């Protein structure tokens, strides 16, 4: 078929134009960089020349940015069976998230300046109810994965980066006064839907990539449709990153609250739930090692799936570390009596055998480096 | 009979139990392992019991004699049999936790363990996930039970259902006493109807199911709406909605208060019009804004429509019809020509009421979907007359 | 009495206002037949008089404005609004002249923005259709649900648009005067009814270029000048009026987006011609390269040995200035794209003063000013203004999300595309109405017209962009959703939609993949699809994975588990529809089970080979629920496969046990034939789940285990016994009439064909003695029977044709393999 | 079932024949006095051709008896109009229709 491929000048004009539009948007429109999140948030955070009266109006009606957060907080608190998909919320959640981070020997002076600049950008949101909105949206999804919850988690991480104590206090206060069980029920459900390494899915992909499929209108060179092995790995990382940031800075009050919610009618132990996912991830990694144990060299697709599994395992270990540091005696006792020891025993078996296997060929040195820091 | 059931029953009122220790003073103290206590079903008022005939059942309060109805929670099935613990005059030491402690229920008198009946095969095809609860000498390893707290809203509602059901059943059987026995020139020849109790109970429930005011902020309004929907579902699942219909039906066989006076006397007939209006008002409150409750009328719609011409509660019945139509699209799909002609006849006989027009508007479009049959029938039977 | 007296008679005012609401309800959502009827009660003169009546009460003024829209404009506006999200741009000379900026001398990178909504737009939009309201025409002899669908009543649009412009202009001046008696009793009642009418007419495209200019002057006389008159944006209106102002600005923002798409399509037509002309010239000179070059000519001709999509990807890869070596375009051609890329970013306000000077700056300033002037209390207004604000800040992203719905077509295919859009508009109108006998006929003929259109097959990508398969699927499930268990109504509509989707999948793999994304959605609606016969949602699911290894390997286990759960249910309960028809109660549903079996047949067998990933899962799922094998193969108390077939034959020969015993019903179900068909389907499925020979020869442990399980389920002797069963042969007698079996109620060669497939794939023929044993009892009697039927009378009989298919697909190919 | 009562005389010489377009202005009321249709409100004359059954059969004979410029009152029995089926939402079943028809011109 290569030697009989039709040249572009023999195609009809309308067909060639359609191909041009697809090529132009991918190479020229998508690649274009336009940063407007900082400018948009700055414009919405300004009160408009209403300071010529300075009376008892000190109630200080919300600024345009504040009204935007209240509107999304309004639809999150609406009594509905399912949180319907909203592109407007997703678009603005990304805008708010992208406006808060904005980020080889950095000195002490500017290191603090970056932290203070980071705090100010986060302050523009959590002082306008953004911290409460994130919790409401998580509780509204009721444990259903999707673009809505993923956008909410990214926004929550954006305002919690660096261990923002002020945001943590606002989130903790809101949960304790409402005494709602939906937030942790949603979190627990999301963690149970997180995927691990599936060998059956991996085996199917290897056969699929060996067929070499093409399309009708032209010919696609091994189309790269969505990965089906740990497809939501990025979602899993931010879900545990969000939980880690709730305890960042050794917030003992939030560390105890994750283990037990005293005011709620029912209690969910998030600390134990994290260990449950770690066991499932560890078992999947152990199964993956046995699959390649007979084989002499791990091929490229296997190494990539190993790398993303280790990245998720790093976040879970970091999240567990943040739960107990400070130290939090209650969380330490909870982990001691949990199945964490079984997971650690399993990881040691995988670590010992993978180190010996990976060291036998220099083509897998990068994977070995990632394995070592995971240990 | 007692079953192990899952699904929606975990949020219903028939899965609620009250633990009653065998004492009055300090009956609210912390529960202790091996402490005898009765287990009472809140909505029915019956007590878990062991009978020589049927085994494990729930019996009335007149048959709970501290021997068939004494149970205790034990941390393990080992036969400790150490000594009868003596109760203290106080709260005591806290032992059993909510949602963490695993409790084995043992019948004190017999020593049997609470477990399931190991359902016979060929019954799974019937969809029966329920496992009958039995008392057995050995039991199984998974007989441990978790005790989960119940919200004060649900606990109060379950007790209200128990009291409401008993009162209306007494009222219903009182009506059936003189169902076809005219009193003549004498007394109705029976116990007096609980007229004052029914009226007060209806008024309390109407205020219990009142929708939240529109002037509230969005946050608390949604919270009250969530509680209201939960309470409507709790009452409906216990047959309260069907109980109200039975009261209406038995009171609807009398065309007027004077006709009702011919069977229940004058002193009971002077409240006949008040009770029927309250019954329809309560019926509307039980279904207003609840699609699940409104969908129940997709099987009995002539029940509401045939009562539209009743003069004693014309406004109340119209409100009930309006609530059903604005919530349940299923009811709109069963609307027939005779139903629409009856609603149109309401304009002819009761005058130009804008609420009847709103009822007709709700028949056309529901949730952004239009019904052509309803639109054509309304147009055919209302417009060309020009009257 | 004068209708103006209702300002004090509030009891009649409320009733009449709700009467107008009832008029809108009965004609709501495309009920054009009722809309014509309403014209006899509220005629055109009354509606036009009510619009200009300044003394009407507010509720009545708002009601009559909405009544006019509902009767005459609601259907046209809704249909037009659905088409506004797509950009089908024909490559016509009018399209070529479209440019991002008007011809001017302001700046090379970007001139001044033109007026939004003013200019030439070539995107295809089907025209509005109206019928004159007449009540003296002869009533059509056509019966109900068969007459053509009624159009919306006709009202003069040119006169209506002039009145709307004049009324809006007067309101702006009147609003400036700050009169203590505004029309309708309030500022809200004066502007909202007028703005709704203007917004509706703008969407319908009634206003011309001059009319749009007048509207822009009223909105903002300073920004929208081309080269007390206060604009609406500065009149301090309430929130209800502000919501209508957002709708107006939303339309003009859409026009700017549409202009960018058309301009981009216009540039594509011009740029492709230069690309094609240059590539033709480059190829011409490249044919002489051997005189001055060598083996690296393959690198230069690499472009011509690549797919056309890849060819144009390489040609446009000169943006980052680090890829100016692989791109063979001359610098002059490269400059044209870069010049257009600069003025495209400028037209989106990327980069390149109290006056906004543009729509983008006007909207952004207005939304921010509104929010910081007061706490907005209307949630609808808050969403509208922030949705509008987001578009202005992200113009390139808005264009990026609109390109997937953009498509360029040849000017010679415009008329067929317009016809297809008309049919698609009819189908989309059925998403907001309960299905009925009249709507069923409209849906069926719309599907037939679409499948009769050449564009539907020439441009599968365009059909996918229009969401045609989604719209048809949503209509089907709504009918299936209602009455999901007791009875399915409008069966002809369901089988028309299902047949449409099956042909949709077979057009291209991309269409097949698109329907594969709804595989779980189709399966959950396929439980009751057994009742309908013909094309079913289960057939659509099967058609979305047939002969596609990529989709077969992507089939999730949950979908297979869902099907097996359905199959398990059919093996334990009788068909409720059959029982209601007087059929004898056998404790299972062979008819329903067979339909699920053939779906699994397509999931595990693709292109003549068994998909081991799916085959292993299906076998394991089947054995975990042994009731999927039927009452036979039950293990304890269960007769063998051979006994079940023999029992089914006796059932077929005996009435009062094979059917109701009252085709008679034109699709009469015979239980004897149904039982054989189930086991034949089951044996066929298990045979196709057998591992391929190369896996068995390789000694794979999983393959050997699966074959051992299959052998245990179906013994070899039962296979030979079924093949050896006699077949009824069309004979002659009783004056010479042909005594033929009824193929729908008897043992057929197709049942034997499944057994042969299992025998070949699972057991095989490895020894000569077994081969001879199979021939003389199972194969040779059938071969002789077919040979004897090759006469003048019996050659064309149904049984003879079935025998030929059985021999030429199962028996003879097997004998050819066993020839050595 | 059409009775034609004259309101204003026409020319009295030219009459519409088969295949000729008739331009009329009409106002239709039910025989009890309730108006349901009128071309005056739409301000556009109604055009139809005789013999093509475009309109109800009552109009076929009624207009044929009229002259150009004549204004007449046509009373149509239910059989010569919509009759038992009627016009849903406009004309009740078994309704006698009364029309005030003016024959503007022929084309």
Swiss-Prot record, chain A:
Domain of life: Eukaryota
Residue ranges the record marks as coiled coil: none
S-nitrosocysteine sites (modified residues): 2
Family membership: Belongs to the ryanodine receptor (TC 1.A.3.1) family. RYR1 subfamily.
Subunit text: Homotetramer. Can also form heterotetramers with RYR2. Identified in a complex composed of RYR1, PDE4D, PKA, FKBP1A and protein phosphatase 1 (PP1). Repeated very high-level exercise decreases interaction with PDE4D and protein phosphatase 1 (PP1). Interacts with CALM; CALM with bound calcium inhibits the RYR1 channel activity. Interacts with S100A1. Interacts with FKBP1A; this stabilizes the closed conformation of the channel. Interacts with CACNA1S; interaction with CACNA1S is important for activation of the RYR1 channel. Interacts with CACNB1.
Other noteworthy facts: Binding of [3H]ryanodine indicates that the heterozygous channel is activated by Ca(2+) concentrations 4-fold lower than normal. Single-cell analysis of cotransfected cells shows a significantly increased resting cytoplasmic Ca(2+) level and a significantly reduced luminal Ca(2+) level.
Function recorded in the entry: Cytosolic calcium-activated calcium channel that mediates the release of Ca(2+) from the sarcoplasmic reticulum into the cytosol and thereby plays a key role in triggering muscle contraction following depolarization of T-tubules. Repeated very high-level exercise increases the open probability of the channel and leads to Ca(2+) leaking into the cytoplasm. Can also mediate the release of Ca(2+) from intracellular stores in neurons, and may thereby promote prolonged Ca(2+) signaling in the brain. Required for normal embryonic development of muscle fibers and skeletal muscle.
Organism ancestry: Eukaryota, Metazoa, Chordata, Craniata, Vertebrata
Post-translational events: The N-terminus is blocked. Channel activity is modulated by phosphorylation.
Comment text on domains: The calcium release channel activity resides in the C-terminal region while the remaining part of the protein constitutes the 'foot' structure spanning the junctional gap between the sarcoplasmic reticulum (SR) and the T-tubule. Pore opening is mediated via the cytoplasmic calcium-binding domains that mediate a small rotation of the channel-forming transmembrane regions that then leads to channel opening.
Binding-site positions, Ca(2+): 248, 322
Protein name from the UniProt record: Ryanodine receptor 1
Location(s), subcellular: Sarcoplasmic reticulum membrane
Tissue specificity: Detected in skeletal muscle (at protein level). Fast- or slow-twitch skeletal muscle.
Curated annotation (Swiss-Prot), chain D:
Subcellular location: Cytoplasm, Cytosol; Sarcoplasmic reticulum membrane
Encoding gene per record: FKBP1A
EC number: 5.2.1.8
Designated name of the protein: Peptidyl-prolyl cis-trans isomerase FKBP1A
Entry keyword annotation includes Cytoplasm: yes
Assigned protein family: Belongs to the FKBP-type PPIase family. FKBP1 subfamily.
A family per Pfam: FKBP_C
Function: Keeps in an inactive conformation TGFBR1, the TGF-beta type I serine/threonine kinase receptor, preventing TGF-beta receptor activation in absence of ligand. Recruits SMAD7 to ACVR1B which prevents the association of SMAD2 and SMAD3 with the activin receptor complex, thereby blocking the activin signal. May modulate the RYR1 calcium channel activity. PPIases accelerate the folding of proteins. It catalyzes the cis-trans isomerization of proline imidic peptide bonds in oligopeptides.
Membrane disposition: Peripheral membrane protein
Catalysed transformations (reactions): [protein]-peptidylproline (omega=180) = [protein]-peptidylproline (omega=0)
Highest taxon, organism lineage: Eukaryota
Regulation: Inhibited by both FK506 and rapamycin.
Residue positions, PTM N6-succinyllysine: 52
Keywords: Acetylation, Cytoplasm, Isomerase, Membrane, Rotamase, Sarcoplasmic reticulum
Modified residue annotations for N6-acetyllysine: 52
Listed GO CC annotations: cytoplasmic side of membrane; cytosol; intracellular membrane-bounded organelle; ryanodine receptor complex; sarcoplasmic reticulum; terminal cisterna
GO function terms (MF aspect): peptidyl-prolyl cis-trans isomerase activity
Top EC class, one word: isomerase
Keyword Cytoplasm: yes
One annotated GO biological process: regulation of ryanodine-sensitive calcium-release channel activity
Organism: Oryctolagus cuniculus (Rabbit)
Tissue: Detected in fast twitch skeletal muscle (at protein level).
Ranges for domain PPIase FKBP-type: 19-107
């Amino acid at each position: 078929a290569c030697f009989r491929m039709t040249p572009l000048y023999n195609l009809p004009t309308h067909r060639a134009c359609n191909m041009f539009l697809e090529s132009y948007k991918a190479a020229w429109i998508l690649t274009e960089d336009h940063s407007f999140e900082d400018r948009m948030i700055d414009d919405l955070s300004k009160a408009g020349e209403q300071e010529e009266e300075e009376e008892e109006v000190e109630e200080k009606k919300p600024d345009p940015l504040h009204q935007l957060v209240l509107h999304f907080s309004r639809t999150a608190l609406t009594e509905k069976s399912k949180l319907d998909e909203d592109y407007l919320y997703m678009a603005y959640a990304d805008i708010m998230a992208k406006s808060c981070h904005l980020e080889v020997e950095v000195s002490f002076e500017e290191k603090e300046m970056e932290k203070q600049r980071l705090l100010y950008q986060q302050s523009r949101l959590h002082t306008r109810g953004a911290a409460e909105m994130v919790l409401q949206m998580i509780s509204a999804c009721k444990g259903e994965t999707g673009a809505m919850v993923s956008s909410t988690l990214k926004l929550g991480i954006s305002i919690l980066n660096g261990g923002n104590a002020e945001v943590q206090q606002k989130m903790l206060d809101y949960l304790k006064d409402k005494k709602e069980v939906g937030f942790f029920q949603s979190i627990q459900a999301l963690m149970q839907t997180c995927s691990v390494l599936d060998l059956n899915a991996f085996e199917r992909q290897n056969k699929a990539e060996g067929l070499g499929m093409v399309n009708e209108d032209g010919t696609v060179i091994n189309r790269q449709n969505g990965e089906k092995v740990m497809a939501d790995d990025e979602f899993t990382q931010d879900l545990f990153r969000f939980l880690q940031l709730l305890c960042e800075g050794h917030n003992n009050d939030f560390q105890n609250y994750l283990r037990t919610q005293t005011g709620n009618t029912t209690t969910i132990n998030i600390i134990i739930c994290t260990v449950d996912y770690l066991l499932r991830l560890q078992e999947s990694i152990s199964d993956f090692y046995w699959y390649y144990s007979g084989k002499d060299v791990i091929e490229e697709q296997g190494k990539r799936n190993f790398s993303k599994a280790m990245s998720v395992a790093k976040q879970v270990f970091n999240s567990l570390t943040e739960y107990i540091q400070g130290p939090c005696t209650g969380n330490q006792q909870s982990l001691a009596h949990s199945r964490l020891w079984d997971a650690v025993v399993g990881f040691l078996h995988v670590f010992a055998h993978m180190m010996m296997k990976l060291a036998q060929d220099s083509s897998q040195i990068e994977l070995l480096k990632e394995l070592l820091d995971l240990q | 009979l007692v079953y192990y059931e899952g699904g929606a029953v975990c949020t219903h009122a028939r899965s609620l139990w009250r633990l009653e220790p065998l004492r009055i003073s300090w009956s609210g103290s912390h529960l202790r392992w091996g402490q005898p206590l009765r287990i009472r079903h809140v909505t029915t008022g019956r007590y878990l019991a062991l009978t020589e005939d049927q085994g494990l059942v729930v019996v009335d309060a007149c048959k709970a004699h501290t021997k068939a109805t004494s149970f205790c929670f034990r941390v393990s099935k080992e036969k400790l049999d150490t000594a009868p613990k003596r109760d203290v005059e106080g709260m005591g030491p806290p032992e059993i936790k909510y949602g963490e402690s695993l409790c084995f229920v043992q019948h004190v008198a017999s020593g049997l363990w609470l477990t399931y009946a190991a359902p016979d095969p060929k019954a799974l095809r019937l969809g029966v996930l329920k496992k009958k609860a039995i008392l057995h000498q050995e039991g199984h390893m998974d007989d441990a039970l978790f005790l989960t707290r119940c919200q004060q809203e649900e606990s109060q509602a379950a007790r209200m259902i128990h009291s409401t059901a008993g009162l209306y059943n007494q009222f219903i059987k009182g009506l059936d006493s003189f169902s076809g026995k005219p009193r003549g020139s004498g007394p109705p020849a029976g116990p007096a109807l609980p007229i004052e109790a029914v009226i007060l109970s209806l008024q309390d429930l109407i205020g219990y199911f009142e929708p939240p005011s529109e002037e509230l902020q969005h946050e608390e309004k949604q919270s009250k709406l969530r509680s209201l929907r939960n309470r409507q579902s709790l009452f409906q699942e216990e047959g309260m909605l069907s109980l109200v219909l039975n009261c209406i039906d038995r009171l609807n066989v009398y065309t007027t208060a004077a006709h009702f006076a011919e069977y229940a006397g004058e002193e009971a007939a002077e409240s006949w019009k008040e009770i029927v209006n309250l019954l329809y008002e309560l019926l509307a409150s039980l279904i207003r804004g609840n699609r699940a409750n409104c969908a129940l009328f997709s099987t009995n719609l002539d029940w509401v429509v045939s009562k539209l011409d009743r003069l004693e509660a014309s406004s109340g019945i119209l409100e009930v019809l309006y609530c059903v139509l604005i919530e349940s699209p299923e009811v709109l799909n069963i609307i027939q020509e005779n139903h629409i002609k009856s609603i149109i006849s309401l304009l002819d006989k009761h005058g130009r009421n804008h609420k009847v027009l709103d009822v007709l508007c709700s028949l056309c479009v529901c949730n952004g979907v239009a019904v052509r049959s309803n639109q054509d029938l309304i147009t055919e039977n209302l417009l060309p007359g020009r009257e | 009495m004068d209708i103006l007296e209702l300002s004090e008679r509030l009891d009649l005012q409320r009733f009449h206002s709700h009467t107008l609401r009832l008029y809108r309800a009965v004609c709501a959502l495309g009920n054009n037949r009722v809309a014509h009827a309403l014209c006899s009660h509220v005629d055109q003169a009354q509606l036009l008089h009510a619009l200009e009546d300044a003394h009407l009460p507010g509720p009545l003024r708002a009601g009559y404005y909405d009544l006019l829209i509902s009767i005459h404009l609601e259907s046209a506006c809704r249909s037009r609004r659905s088409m506004l999200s797509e950009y089908i741009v024909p490559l016509t000379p009018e399209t070529r002249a479209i440019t991002l900026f008007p011809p001017g001398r302001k700046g090379g990178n970007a001139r001044r923005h033109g007026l939004p909504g003013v200019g030439v737009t070539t995107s295809l939009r089907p025209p509005h259709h109206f019928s004159p309201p007449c009540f003296v025409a002869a009533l059509p002899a056509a019966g109900v649900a068969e007459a053509p669908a009624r159009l919306s009543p006709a009202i003069p649009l040119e006169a209506l648009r002039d009145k709307a412009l004049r009324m809006l202009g007067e309101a702006v001046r009147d609003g400036g005067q700050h009169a203590r008696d505004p029309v309708g009793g309030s500022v809200e009642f004066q502007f909202v009814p007028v703005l709704k009418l203007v917004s509706t007419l703008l969407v319908m495209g009634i206003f011309g270029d001059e009319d749009v200019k007048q509207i822009l002057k009223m909105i903002e006389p300073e920004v929208f000048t081309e080269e007390l008159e206060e604009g609406l944006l500065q009149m301090k209106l309430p929130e209800s009026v502000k919501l209508q102002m957002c709708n107006l600005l939303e339309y003009f923002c859409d026009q700017e987006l549409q202009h960018r798409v058309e301009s981009l399509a216009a540039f594509a037509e011009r740029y492709v011609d230069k690309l094609q002309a240059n590539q033709r010239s480059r190829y011409a000179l490249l044919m002489r390269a051997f005189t001055m070059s060598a083996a690296e000519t393959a690198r230069r001709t690499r472009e011509f040995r690549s797919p056309p999509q890849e060819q144009i990807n390489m040609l446009l890869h000169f943006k980052d200035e680090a890829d100016e070596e692989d791109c063979p375009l001359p610098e002059d051609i490269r400059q044209d794209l870069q010049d257009f890329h600069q003025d495209l970013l400028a037209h989106c306000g990327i980069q390149l003063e109290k006056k906004p000077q543009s729509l983008q700056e006007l909207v952004s300033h207005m939304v921010v000013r509104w929010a910081q002037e007061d706490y907005v209390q209307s949630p609808e207004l808050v969403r509208a203004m922030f949705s509008l604000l987001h578009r202005q800040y992200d113009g390139l992203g808005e264009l990026l999300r609109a390109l997937p719905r953009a498509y360029t077509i040849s000017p010679s295919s415009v008329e067929d595309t317009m016809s297809l859009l008309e049919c698609l508009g009819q189908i989309r109108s059925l998403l907001i109405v309960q299905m009925g006998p009249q709507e069923e006929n409209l849906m069926i003929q719309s599907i037939g017209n679409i499948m009769n259109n050449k564009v539907f097959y020439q441009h599968p990508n365009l059909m996918r962009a229009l969401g045609m398969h989604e719209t048809v699927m949503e209509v089907m499930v709504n009918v299936l959703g209602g009455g999901e268990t007791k009875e399915i109504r409008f069966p002809k509509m369901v089988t028309s939609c299902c047949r449409f989707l099956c042909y949709f999948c077979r057009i291209s793999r991309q269409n097949q993949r698109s329907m594969f994304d709804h595989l779980s959605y189709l399966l959950e609606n396929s439980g009751i699809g057994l009742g309908m016969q013909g094309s079913t949602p289960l057939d659509v699911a099967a058609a979305s994975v047939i002969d596609n290894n990529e989709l077969a390997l992507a089939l999730q286990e949950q979908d297979l588990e869902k099907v097996v759960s359905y199959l398990a249910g059919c093996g334990l309960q009788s068909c409720p529809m059959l029982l209601a028809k007087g059929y004898p109660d056998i404790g299972w549903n062979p008819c329903g089970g067979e339909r699920y079996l053939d779906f699994l047949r397509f999931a595990v067998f693709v292109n003549g080979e068994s998909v081991e990933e799916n085959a292993n899962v299906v076998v394991r799922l089947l054995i975990r629920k042994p009731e999927c094998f039927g009452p036979a193969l039950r293990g304890e108390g269960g007769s063998g496969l051979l006994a079940a077939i023999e029992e089914a034959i006796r059932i077929s020969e005996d009435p009062a046990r094979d059917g109701p015993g009252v085709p008679p019903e034109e699709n009469r179900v015979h239980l004897g034939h149904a039982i054989m068909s189930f086991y034949a389907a089951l044996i066929d499925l298990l045979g196709r789940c057998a591992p391929e020979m190369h896996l068995i020869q390789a000694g794979k442990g999983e393959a050997l285990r699966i074959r051992a399980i299959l052998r245990s389920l179906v013994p070899l002797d039962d296979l030979v016994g079924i093949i050896s069963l006699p077949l009824q042969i069309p004979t002659l007698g009783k004056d010479g009439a042909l005594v033929q079996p009824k193929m729908s109620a008897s043992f057929v060669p197709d049942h034997k064909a499944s057994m042969v497939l299992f025998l070949d794939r699972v057991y095989g023929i490895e020894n000569q003695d077994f081969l001879l044993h199979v021939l003389d009892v199972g194969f040779l009697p059938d071969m002789r029977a077919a040979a004897s039927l090759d006469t003048a009378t019996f050659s064309t009989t149904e049984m003879a044709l079935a025998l030929n298919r059985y021999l030429c697909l199962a028996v003879l190919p097997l004998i050819t393999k066993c020839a050595p | 079932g059409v009775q034609v009562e004259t309101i204003s005389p026409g020319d009295g010489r030219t009459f519409p024949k088969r295949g000729q377009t008739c331009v009329v202005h009409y106002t239709g009321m039910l025989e009890d006095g309730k108006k349901f249709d009128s071309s005056r409100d739409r301000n556009k004359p109604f055009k139809f051709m005789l013999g093509k059954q475009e309109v109800i059969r009552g109009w076929e004979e009624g207009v044929a008896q009229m002259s150009v410029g004549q204004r007449a009152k046509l009373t149509i029995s239910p059989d010569y109009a919509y009759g038992a089926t009627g016009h849903p939402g406009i004309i009740p079943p078994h309704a006698t229709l009364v029309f005030d028809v003016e024959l503007l011109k022929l084309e």
